Amino acid sequence: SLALAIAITALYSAVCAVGLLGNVLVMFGIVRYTKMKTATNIYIFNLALADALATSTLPFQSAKYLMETWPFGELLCKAVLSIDYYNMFTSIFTLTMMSVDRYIAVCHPVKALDFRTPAKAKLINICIWVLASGVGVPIMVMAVTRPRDGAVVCMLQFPSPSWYWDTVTKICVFLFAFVVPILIITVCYGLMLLRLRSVRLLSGSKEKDRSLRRITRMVLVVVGAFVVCWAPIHIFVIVWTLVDIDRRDPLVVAALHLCIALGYANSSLNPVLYAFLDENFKRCFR
Amino acid sequence: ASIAQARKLVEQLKMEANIDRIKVSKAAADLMAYCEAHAKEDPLLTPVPASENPFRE
Amino acid sequence: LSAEDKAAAERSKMIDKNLREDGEKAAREVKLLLLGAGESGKNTIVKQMKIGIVETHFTFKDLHFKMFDVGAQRSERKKWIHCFEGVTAIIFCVALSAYDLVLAEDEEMNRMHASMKLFDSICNNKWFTDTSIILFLNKKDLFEEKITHSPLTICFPEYTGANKYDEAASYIQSKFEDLNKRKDTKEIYTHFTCSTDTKNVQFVFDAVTDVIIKNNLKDCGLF
Amino acid sequence: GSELDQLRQEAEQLKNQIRDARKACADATLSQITNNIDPVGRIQMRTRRTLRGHLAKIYAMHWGTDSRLLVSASQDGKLIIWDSYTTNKVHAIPLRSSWVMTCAYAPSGNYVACGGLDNICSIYNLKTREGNVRVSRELAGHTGYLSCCRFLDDNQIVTSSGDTTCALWDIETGQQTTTFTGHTGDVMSLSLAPDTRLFVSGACDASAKLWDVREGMCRQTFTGHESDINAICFFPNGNAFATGSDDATCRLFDLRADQELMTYSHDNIICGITSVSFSKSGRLLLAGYDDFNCNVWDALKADRAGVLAGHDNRVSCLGVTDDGMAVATGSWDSFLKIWN
Amino acid sequence: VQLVESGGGLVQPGGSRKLSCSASGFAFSSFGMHWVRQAPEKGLEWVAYISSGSGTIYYADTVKGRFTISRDDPKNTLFLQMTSLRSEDTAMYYCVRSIYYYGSSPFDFWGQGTTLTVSSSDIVMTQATSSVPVTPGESVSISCRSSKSLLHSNGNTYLYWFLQRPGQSPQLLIYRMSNLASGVPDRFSGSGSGTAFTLTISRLEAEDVGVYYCMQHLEYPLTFGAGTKLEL
Ligand SMILES: CCN(CC)C(=O)c1ccc(C2=CC3(CCNCC3)Oc3cccc(O)c32)cc1
C-alpha cells in the first residue's frame, strides 16, 4: 500500500516534475525565437500558457489523495477547481484549431493566402481563450465545500434533482469534449493525407518517400496520444455513472487516481510532442 | 580606333604617367599628425559622458 | 511629449499603418521570372499568357500573376541575380524548332547547344537551391513539318533512333531534364506548346499551386 | 599595347622609384613608421535603438547633413525618411518602379534621389506648397541599371554610375554634362571629396578610378585587389580613401604617392565585406561583413577593437553621422541598428 | 492653392448654425486644420483642431461643449456645427492649414473668413506695447512678454509671429525665433530668451503697415497676444 503511495506520487511527481519544467522552457524558447512570424508560432504560444496552468493545478489534488482530506479553506476550493476545468477546455480547443488550419493550408491553396496572415491568427486566439472562459466561469461560481466521514470534500451542487436534471452537465462535457473534437480533428487530418498523397512533391521516388512516411507518422502519433491519454478518464466517469454495484472500495481509489493521473499526463507530453518533432524548431536546435 | 583610343588611350595612358609623385614616409607622417590633432574631438574613439552624449537610453 | 512631438508621434503612426496594409496587399501575389534565351518564342507564351525590366500582370481563377521579364540588361547577371530570390517559379522557355539553324552569335555554337548552357547556369545557382523550374517548348508545328527532311542526328551525335515526332520529343525532354544536380527538393516540369490557347495558362496555374502547397507544408511545422 | 607596356612599365618604375623612395625614407609598412604609437584600448559599443519599418531587405541608407535625418531604401518600393534621435518617420515615398539598389540625400534637405535596375533615375521634391511629395525630374538615357546616385554640393548637379559609364547632369535642363568614361567592368561604388571638386569610383575589375569634374578625365587609377569592389569611402582629410572587395581584405590607398598603405585581415574571417566608413577622429574604421557582424579596426594599428555583432543577416549598409556621434548599420534582416 | 469658407449671416440667441470650409489646390487628407476667431477691432482666438486621420480633435476653453466641428475627406469639406448663440461670438472666422514633422511650419496658409454676426493653466503672454508712430526707413523693435519659460528639454521654444495688412487675412513671418518663414523678405528678424522675446525690422516701407501678433504653442491651450499696431 505504502509502495503504491510513494509510487503515483512519484507518478504524478514524475509526471508533474517532468510537465512543469518542460512547459517552463518552451514557453520562453518560443519567446526569444521566431515569436509570431508564422501562425504555428502564436498557436504554440497558446499551448504553453495552457499547459502552464495545469502544472500549478495538479499538486494540490495529489495532496488530497495523499491526505484524503483538504487542509485549506474555501478560497482554494474554488480557486483550485476552475483553474482546472478551463485549462481543460483551452487545451482541447487549441489543438482542434491548430488541426483545421493545417487542412485549409494543405488542401485549398488559392484561399489559403488571404486567410493565413498573423493578423487573423491573433484574432482566432482571442475568440478561444475568450469563448472558454465563458465556458469556465459558471464552475467558478458554483463551487461549494461539504463535510462527510470526518473528511472535507470540494464537490459541486445544483438545485436540480441532482440525479435527473443536472447530472447531464457531466454527459455534455463528454460529447463536446470528446466526440466533436476527436471527430473534427480525425476527418481534417484524413482529408489532409489523401491530397498530400496526390501532390507531386512529397511523392514520387522512394528517395523522398520516406518523407511521406514521417509526415504520415506524426500525423499518426498525436492523434493517438490524444486518443489514448485523454480517453480513459471519460470512459470511467461514464461507468461510474453507469455501474451501481461497487462504490467506496480500498482498490478503486487507487485507479481513479491512477487514471486521473495519466490525465495530467496528457497535458505534460502535450506540449511536449510539439517541441520534439517540430521541424522549424529542429532547425532552430541545429 | 582603338589605336586612336590607343593613341587616345595611350594618350590617356600618357596623361597618367606625367605626375609629380612624393615620398611615402611624408604621407604616413601626415596621416599620423591628422590622427593625433583631432583625437580628442572623436566621440567613437574617446568615450563621451552620458550627459554630453545626445544618444541616451 | 511637447504638444508638438505628440503630433509627430501621431503622424508616424499613420505612416506605419499605411505601409503595413500595402505590404499585406502584396503578399498574396505570385511572382514569376521569365528568364529566356534570345528570340526563342518568349514573346509568345507572353504573347498569349494574358488572354529594362518588363512587367506582366494577369489573373486567372482568382489569383493574380505578375511576370518579370528581363532581356535588355546585358550586364553581369551575378550582381543582380541576387535581387530575384523568393520567387515561386522561373519559367524557362526552349524552342523545339531550334536545333537546325545557327545562332548569329557564332557558327560553332548550336542554338540549342547553348540553350542548355543557359539552362545549366541558372538551375545550379546558389541563390536558387529550392525553386521549381517550369519548362515550355515552343513551335511544335515547325518541329513536325521538317523533322522528316532534316535528321535530328545533326546535333547530339549520341542519338540512335528513328525520326518520328514521338521518339525525338522524348529524347529532347530527357536530355533537358537530366541537368538537375539535386533532385531531393528542386523540381523541373515539361510541357509542349503551339499556337493553341487555353492549354498553356492552365499549366502555369498547376505548377504554381504545387509550389504553394510545398511552401505552406514547409512553414507550418509538417514538412 | 606595346607603348602601353612601355609607359605602364615606366610608371611601375616611377612607382618603383616612389617605392624606392618609399623604402628609402620609410619601412613602407607605414606601421613601423608608427612603431612609436601607443595602442588604443577595446571599444565596446552598444546599441541605442533598433529601427523597424521595412519588410524586406534594405539596399540603401544615407545620412543627412544635420546628423538628424535618415533615408533608407528597401526592395518593397518604399523610400522612408525619419528622425534618428527619436526613431520617428517623417515621410514615406512610393515609387513607380520597385528594384532600387541605392539612394541619395541632397545636402540641402530639399530633394532625394533613388534609382536602380530600371535605367531611369528619379529626383523627388519634398518642399511643395502642394503639401505632398512628387517627382521633379526622371533622368533617362542610360542603357543599364543605376548603381549609385549622388548630389554635387547643390540641388542642381547630381552624379551617377550604372552599367559601364559614370555620367553627370543638371537637374533643370535634364541633359547630361561631362559624361565620364574609361571603365571596362560595371561600376558599383561612387564617392566624392568634402569640398567636392574631385571623386573616385569602383567597377567589377580589380581597379579604382578618380575623377575630376572640371574636365571629366581620370586623375588617377588604383589597383591591388583580387575580387569585386563592394564599397569605397574616403578619409576625413581628403587625401585618403578606404576601399573594399569580395576577398575579405579591405585596402587603404593615398593620392600623392599612389600605392596602398595598410592591409587588414584575419584567418578567422574568410567571407567578404560590403561597406566601409570612417569616424571623424581618424583612428577607428567600421567594416560590415557577410559574417553577420561588423568588426571595427583601429586604422593606425591592425587590431580589432570591438565586434559590433548584433545582426542576423548580411550587412548591406554602414554609416557614421557627420558629427561622429554614432554609427548606423543595415543587413538583409530589415532592421536598422543604431550603435552608440 | 485655394481655400474658401461659407455659412455666416445673422443668427438669434439660443439657436444654432454651421460653418463649411472648402479647400482646393492641395492634398486635404495629409494636413491638420485649425479655426481662429477675431472679433471686430480685437485680437485672435483659437477654436478647434482636427488632426490627419481624425484622431485628436481638441476644442477651446469658452467654446468647449457648445461647439462641434468635423471634416469630410471625400468632399474635403469641414463641418463645424455650432450649438448656442450667446451674441459674444460675433467674429470673422478664418481656417488655417498646418502640418507637424521635423522641420514643419505650422499655420502656413490662411483664408478669408465669413463675417459671422449675432443679433443682440494657459501660459499668459501679453505685449506691453499698444502703438508706435513710424516713418519710412526707421528701424522698429517690438517686444513680447510671457509668464513661463517657453523652452523645453528638446532644445527649442514655441513662439509664432503674424502680420495683418488692413483689409485682408493675416500671414506668417517668424515661427520659432531663429527661423524665418517662406514668402517673407529678409528685413524682419526675431530673437529672445526665457521670457524676453523680441521682433526687429531694419528697413520699413509703406507696405509694412499692419497689426502684429505673437503667440504660444507649448501647451494644449493656445494663447495669443494683443496687437502692437504700427500706424503711419
Ligand atoms: C467525477 C468522478 N469521480 C468520482 C465519481 C472523481 O473522483 C473524479 C474523476 C475525474 C476528475 C477529472 C480530472 C480532470 C479535470 C481537468 N484536468 C485535470 C483533471 O479532468 C477531468 C475531465 C472531465 C471529467 C472529470 O471528472 C475530470 C475529477 C473527479
Distance, in angstroms, between A94 CA and closest chain C CA?
A: 15
Q: Tell me, yes or no, if C10 comes closer than 8 A to chain E by beta carbon.
A: yes
Q: Where are the alpha helices (DSSP H) in A36-117?
A: 39-67, 75-107
Q: In this complex, how many residue pairs, one in chain B and one in chain D, have their CB atoms less than 8 Å apart?
A: 146
Look at residues D158, D189, D220 and tell me which one is the last residue of a structural domain: D220
Instruction: Tell me which method was used to determine the 3D structure.
Output: cryo-EM
Interface test with E, best of D129, D130, D133, D134 (most E CBs within 10 A): D129
What's the rounded Cα separation, in Å, for the pair C69 and D199? Answer: 35
| Residue ranges lining ligand 1, Cβ < 6 Å | A 84-85, 88, 173, 233, 237, 240, 256, 260, 263-264
Determine whether the interchain pair E102/D68 forms a contact, defined as Cβ–Cβ distance below 8 Å. yes
Maximum alpha-carbon separation in chain E: 52
Give, using CA atoms, the residue closest to atom 3 of ligand 1: A237
Q: Which fold has domain E2-118?
A: Immunoglobulin-like (2.60.40)
Determine whether the interchain pair E1/D130 forms a contact, defined as Cβ–Cβ distance below 8 Å. yes
Distance, in angstroms, between D85 CA and closest chain B CA?
A: 7
What's the rounded Cα separation, in Å, for the pair B42 and A67? Answer: 72
What's the rounded Cα separation, in Å, for the pair A95 and A98? Answer: 5
- For residue D195, the 8-state DSSP code is T
Q: Tell me, yes or no, if D324 comes closer than 8 A to chain C by beta carbon.
A: no
Residues 15-54 of E with CB under 8 A from D: 25-27, 30-31
Nearest CA in chain D to E100: D90
What's the rounded Cα separation, in Å, for the pair E165 and E206? Answer: 11
User: In terms of CATH, what superfamily is C33-217?
Assistant: P-loop containing nucleotide triphosphate hydrolases (3.40.50.300)
Chain A contact set for C212 (CB, 8 A): 109, 112-113
Q: Which fold has domain E131-230?
A: Immunoglobulin-like (2.60.40)
- Chains near E (3 or more Cβ pairs under 8 Å): C, D
Strands (E), D45-176: 47-51, 58-63, 69-74, 78-83, 88-94, 103-105, 111-114, 122-125, 134-137, 148-151, 158-161, 166-168
Contacting residues for A232 by C-beta, under 8 A, at least 6 apart = A259, A262, A263
What's the rounded Cα separation, in Å, for the pair E151 and D78? Answer: 36
Chain D contact set for E152 (CB, 8 A): none
- Contact indicator for C40, E81 with CB cutoff of 8 Å: no
What's the rounded Cα separation, in Å, for the pair E4 and E21? Answer: 6
From the list D88, D109, D130, which residue is nearest E27 (CB)?
D130
Chain C contact set for A108 (CB, 8 A): none
Question: Which element (helix H / strand E) includes A5?
Answer: helix A2-32
Please give the grid coordinates belonging to residue A208.
523522398
SS3 content of chain D, % helix, strand, coil (to 5): 10, 35, 55
Residue E21 burial (CB count, 10 A): 24
Contacting residues for D80 by C-beta, under 8 A, at least 6 apart = C19, D53, D54, D71, D72, D74, D89, D91, D92, D93
Determine whether the interchain pair B17/D14 forms a contact, defined as Cβ–Cβ distance below 8 Å. yes
Nearest CA in chain D to E99: D131
Chain D contact set for B43 (CB, 8 A): 280, 323-326
What burial letters (b/e) apply to A48-84, b meaning 16+ CB within 10 Å? bebbbbbbebbebbbebbeeeebeeeeebbbebbbbb
What's the rounded Cα separation, in Å, for the pair C115 and C100? Answer: 13
DSSP code per residue over E99-132: --STT--SS------EE-EE------EE-S--B-
Please give the grid coordinates belonging to residue D250.
579591405
User: Based on the domain organization, do D192 and D266 belong to the same domain?
Assistant: no
What's the rounded Cα separation, in Å, for the pair D176 and D142? Answer: 10
The angle at the Cα of E204, spanning E199 to E210, to the nearest 5 degrees, equals 70
A and C touching (3 or more beta-carbon pairs closer than 8 Å): yes
What's the rounded Cα separation, in Å, for the pair A111 and A116? Answer: 9
Q: Tell me, yes or no, if D3 comes closer than 8 A to chain B by beta carbon.
A: yes
User: Does some domain include residue D249?
Assistant: yes
Domain residue ranges in chain B: 3-55
**Ranges of CATH 2.60.40.10 domains, chain E:** 2-118, 131-230
What's the rounded Cα separation, in Å, for the pair D63 and D70? Answer: 5
SS3 sequence of C120-169? HHHHCCCCCCCCEECEEEECHHHHCCCCCCCCHHHCCCCCCCCCCHHHHH
The rounded Å distance from CA A250 to ligand 1 centre is 19
- Contact indicator for C222, A106 with CB cutoff of 8 Å: yes
Maximum alpha-carbon separation in chain D: 65
Strands (E), E16-170: 17-24, 32-38, 44-49, 58-59, 70-72, 77-82, 92-98, 114-115, 117-118, 125-126, 140-146, 159-164
Determine whether the interchain pair D90/E101 forms a contact, defined as Cβ–Cβ distance below 8 Å. yes
Chain B contact set for D14 (CB, 8 A): 17, 19, 21
What's the rounded Cα separation, in Å, for the pair A264 and E9? Answer: 78
Determine whether the interchain pair D281/B44 forms a contact, defined as Cβ–Cβ distance below 8 Å. yes
Q: Where are the alpha helices (DSSP H) in A162-251?
A: 168-174, 180-198, 206-240
What's the rounded Cα separation, in Å, for the pair B13 and D5? Answer: 10
Domain that residue A78 falls in: 2-285
Determine whether the interchain pair E217/C4 forms a contact, defined as Cβ–Cβ distance below 8 Å. yes
Q: What is the CATH number of the domain that holds A122?
A: 1.20.1070.10
- Contact indicator for D99, C53 with CB cutoff of 8 Å: yes
DSSP code per residue over D277-292: ---TTSS--BEEESSS
Overall number of domains in chain D: 2
With CA atoms as reference, report the closest residue to A85 among A139, A126, A125.
A139
Q: Tell me, yes or no, if C100 comes closer than 8 A to chain A by beta carbon.
A: no
- Chains near B (3 or more Cβ pairs under 8 Å): D
Residues comprising chain C, all counted: 223
Contacting residues for A222 by C-beta, under 8 A, at least 6 apart = A95, A273
The rounded Å distance from CA A233 to ligand 1 centre is 7
The rounded Å distance from CA A93 to ligand 1 centre is 18
Determine whether the interchain pair B24/D25 forms a contact, defined as Cβ–Cβ distance below 8 Å. yes
Name where chain B breaks: residue before each gap, C-N > 2.5 Å.
none
What's the rounded Cα separation, in Å, for the pair E158 and A23? Answer: 54
Chain D contact set for B32 (CB, 8 A): 34, 37, 300
Maximum alpha-carbon separation in chain C: 86
Q: Is the four-CA dihedral E25, E28, E31, E33 of positive or negative sign?
A: positive
Cα–Cα distances in angstroms (integers) from residue C36 to residues C41, C89, C92, C93, C182, in the given order:
9, 13, 6, 6, 22
The rounded Å distance from CA A263 to ligand 1 centre is 9
Determine whether the interchain pair B42/D4 forms a contact, defined as Cβ–Cβ distance below 8 Å. no
- Contact indicator for E2, E8 with CB cutoff of 8 Å: no
- Residue for grid cell 607605414: D30
What's the rounded Cα separation, in Å, for the pair C9 and C5? Answer: 6
DSSP code per residue over C202-223: HHHHHHHHHHHHHHHHHTTT--
- Contact indicator for D277, D233 with CB cutoff of 8 Å: yes
Q: What is the CATH number of the domain that holds D249?
A: 2.130.10.10
What's the rounded Cα separation, in Å, for the pair C127 and C125? Answer: 5
User: Does some domain include residue D1?
Assistant: no
The rounded Å distance from CA A256 to ligand 1 centre is 9
Nearest CA in chain D to B25: D26
User: Based on the domain organization, do D187 and D273 belong to the same domain?
Assistant: no
Please give the grid coordinates belonging to residue C218.
514547409
- Residue for grid cell 458554483: A142
What's the rounded Cα separation, in Å, for the pair D62 and A215? Answer: 48
User: If 0-12 CB within 10 Å is exposed, 13-18 middle and 19+ buried, where does residue A177 land?
Assistant: middle
Domain residue ranges in chain C: 33-217
Q: Tell me, yes or no, if D140 comes closer than 8 A to chain C by beta carbon.
A: no
User: Does some domain include residue D71?
Assistant: no
Helical packing angle, A75-107 and A39-67, nearest 10°: 150
Cα E28–chain centre separation: 19
What's the rounded Cα separation, in Å, for the pair C83 and D77? Answer: 13
- For residue A175, the 8-state DSSP code is I
Strand pairing category for C89-90 and C30-33: parallel
Distance, in angstroms, between B51 CA and closest chain D CA?
A: 13
Please give the grid coordinates belonging to residue E3.
481655400
What burial letters (b/e) apply to C135-174, b meaning 16+ CB within 10 Å? bbbbbbeebbeebeeeebeeeeeeeeeeeeeeebbebbbe
Overall number of domains in chain A: 1
| CATH architecture assigned to B3-55 | Irregular (4.10)
Nearest CA in chain E to C18: E53
Contacting residues for C17 by C-beta, under 8 A, at least 6 apart = none
User: Does some domain include residue D296?
Assistant: yes
Distance, in angstroms, between C189 CA and closest chain A CA?
A: 11
SS3 of D211, please? strand
The rounded Å distance from CA A244 to ligand 1 centre is 18
Give, using CA atoms, the residue closest to atom 19 of ligand 1: A260
